[PDB]
């Protein structure tokens, strides 16, 4: 059975937590990566993939042809029996999910604004309230759902990576989160991935973004 | 066993699709509604509910204490065996979910901007691409996942309701969506709900929003 395909821009963006989950699980996959100058190339292929809701990212494995980043990461998790063993645990994991997205989408939704520098002040003013809930969550816990890794762990990791670019001191007040970020980096298969040529360091958002864009870090 | 509690602002906002699902399922529930002048009241209660990630909406039923609107609607769906019977169907439903949220969050993310009137032009320019995928999806289908209702049907319904306020003609080119909206309204338990005193007609977003705010429609 062939390697499934993960299609996306050559950026971190929406799919970075999925990459980390895949690498955590030591799953084989191949990426179809779209470059900065391949917009027309993508548009010419977008409607020729059998996708119900054509978009990036997409995931194709011979059983599914998916779009929506959260459907994709949840499918991979689900195929490894990680979404939760009953309605209460599935709800817990979806709740963790959404709370992470409040941070990650909080970034994405202002990153392309001409008025980023201003909107950034409001986001960073609210951010400690969001981080505090995760700091608390990690009291005497190894991962967000206890002693075992779940996909929101990699979502949170990505969110922390990204907000540190917006303000390198924003975790100084949250030592358990700083520790969590290091703990994820100390998973050997993640360590190996981050050191590999498959790791995409930059950009964070699309290249044209005001925050987290461009070909290289500022 | 007592009526579960759904807590939220007295607005449509993030929770309207959940209300519709509950009413579809003819489930008993009570809402704790926060009014426009009850911000301090909420802030004084927010951290005293046993919530891991305090926020609005919340859902409490004696088995769970949830936040995150999508965790909540998925829990209710899950308790009625509606999330999908296998990984492929669960992924399909999550994909529908996300594609709806691209429209609904597309609105929410610009609705509080001082620059709404400008951002609105871009959103409405892109909107037909998003609607087209649903128009296509509904070719010879009664609901988004075929012959039976799923929670993204009510998410889509809410999204259509809302974008019609932004532009009353935006569905003129999508007759299957206009029909879908009427078909949802023709579910007798939804018809009854929309005519009831429990229905909240306005606002769409928070009261202070530039779009979909205020005490009454413009
Ligand atoms: N809600 C969707 C949003 C997808 C999206 O906005 N993709 C952007 C890149 S971050 C894109 O370029 N899509 C390509 C297209 O619209 O054709 C998701 O989570 O996957
Ligand atoms: N991602 C969260 C966002 C929740 C959110 O932004 N809630 C707003 C109203 S739409 C609020 O007033 N929360 C109250 C608070 O932050 O204390 C969700 O889907 O539930």
Author numbering:
A (entry chain A), B (entry chain A): -1 to 216
What does the publication say?
We previously synthesized an iodinated variant (7iGST) of eukaryotic glutathione S-transferase (GST), a homodimeric detoxification enzyme, in which seven specific residues of the 15 tyrosines per monomer were replaced by 3-iodo-l-tyrosines. The seven sites, specified with seven UAG codons in the gene, were distributed globally in the enzyme, including four on the surface (positions −1, 22, 141, and 163), two buried (positions 57 and 155), and one at the dimer interface (position 73). In the present study, two additional variants (7bGST and 7cGST), which contained 3-bromo- and 3-chlorotyrosines, respectively, in place of 3-iodotyrosine, were also synthesized in RFzero-iy, with these tyrosine derivatives being supplemented in the growth media. The structural study showed that the chlorination and bromination of the selected tyrosine residues achieved a more tightly packed protein interior, with the bulky atoms filling internal spaces and creating additional interresidue interactions.
The halogenation at position 32 significantly increased the heat resistance of 3bGST and 3cGST, whereas those at positions 27 and 56 each abolished the resistance. Finally, position 32 was halogenated and position 155 was made halogen-free in the initial variants 7bGST and 7cGST, to create 7bGST-1 and 7cGST-1, respectively. The heat resistance was drastically increased (0 to 71% for 7bGST-1, 11 to 79% for 7cGST-1), and was accompanied by significant recoveries of the specific activity (47 to 67% for 7bGST-1 and 60 to 72% for 7cGST-1). The ΔG(H2O) values for 7bGST-1 and 7cGST-1 (33.3 and 32.9 kcal/mol, respectively) were larger by 5.6 and 5.2 kcal/mol, respectively, than that of wtGST. The major stabilizing positions 32, 57, and 73 are located in domain I, which consists of a four-stranded β-sheet and three α-helices. The side chains of the halogenated tyrosines at positions 32 and 57 (Hal32 and Hal57) protrude from each side of the β-sheet, and are buried in the protein interior. The halogen moiety of Hal32 fills the space between the side chains of Lys39 and Lys43, while that of Hal57 fills the space between the side chains of Pro2, Leu4, Leu20, and Tyr27. The halogen moiety of Hal73 occupies the space at the dimer interface, between the side chains of Lys77 and Lys86, where Lys86 belongs to the other monomer. The halogen atoms are accommodated in spaces with sizes between 1.25 and 1.70 Å for wtGST, while the radii of the bromine and chlorine atoms are 1.85 and 1.75 Å, respectively. Thus, the bulky halogens do not simply occupy vacant spaces that are large enough for the atoms, but fit into the spaces by causing local structural changes, probably involving side-chain movements, which cannot be identified from the crystal structures with the present resolutions.
